[PDB]
Amino acid sequence: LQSYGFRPTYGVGHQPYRVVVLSFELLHAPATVCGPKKSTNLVKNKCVNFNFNGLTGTGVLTESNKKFLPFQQFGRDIADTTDAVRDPQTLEILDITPCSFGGVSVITPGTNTSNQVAVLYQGVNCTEVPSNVFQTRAGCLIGAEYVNNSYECDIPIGAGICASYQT
């Protein structure tokens, strides 16, 4: 074992260089030391793309009223679909309602009568669709005015409502 020198008046090439050698290996374990996932704050009452510690999904986040057992992270509903999560950072329980949806149908008297049309969005609230914006209880009729009189069924709209070309 011979001792080094390490006078300060040595050239670079005889100076003490400290060295750290990292050696990573990935042997057997399914989870070990890992780097840091990033974290972007969450928005409330907005349809967003979310990830809660692995759970990937889409939907609107809202304040819940469920109570998880301190060891549970998320809940599922009947039919086995996630319906509530617990925020890993703030530890609050939030319900997940899905982004509204439904079919779109066009009501037309026929091009040989008129070219006007009204549209009913089935069980869609008239505030989440994107004049006459009636809110039937089986959609959200746009383009027709709702009156309190009564006539014979013309074009059935559903649930005791109807449309028709009048004045």
Binding site: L27, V33, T40, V48, Q89, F101, V104, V106, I107, D154
Partner: protein
């Protein structure tokens, strides 16, 4: 015109005609997470007062942590820094065992 395209006709008689589907897209994204925990101190191994000599080198085994390599970038110019199996720009998104 969407109704006429659905029926494949140019005359649409009276009635409700289902044409399309209404689905709402998601504003943006929200990746949230847990605060923090163990940080597996490099500091000690990158700042010891007495490195061991070369014939009898230390060997610190690094146990469970979250490993921010961004640090280790606050020590000097590093006369070197050669990552061999990995590329050093991607280290903050990988899991290692030992």
């Amino acid at each position: 015109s969407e109704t006429k395209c659905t029926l494949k006709s140019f005359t649409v008689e009276k009635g409700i005609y289902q044409t399309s589907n209404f689905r709402v897209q998601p504003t943006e994204s929200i990746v949230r997470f847990p605060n923090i925990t163990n940080l597996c101190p490099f500091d000690e191994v990158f700042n010891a007062t007495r490195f061991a000599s070369v014939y009898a080198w230390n060997r610190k085994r690094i146990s469970n942590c979250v490993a921010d390599y961004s640090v280790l970038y606050n020590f000097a110019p590093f006369f070197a820094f050669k990552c061999y199996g990995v590329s050093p720009t991607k280290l903050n998104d990988l899991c290692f065992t030992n």
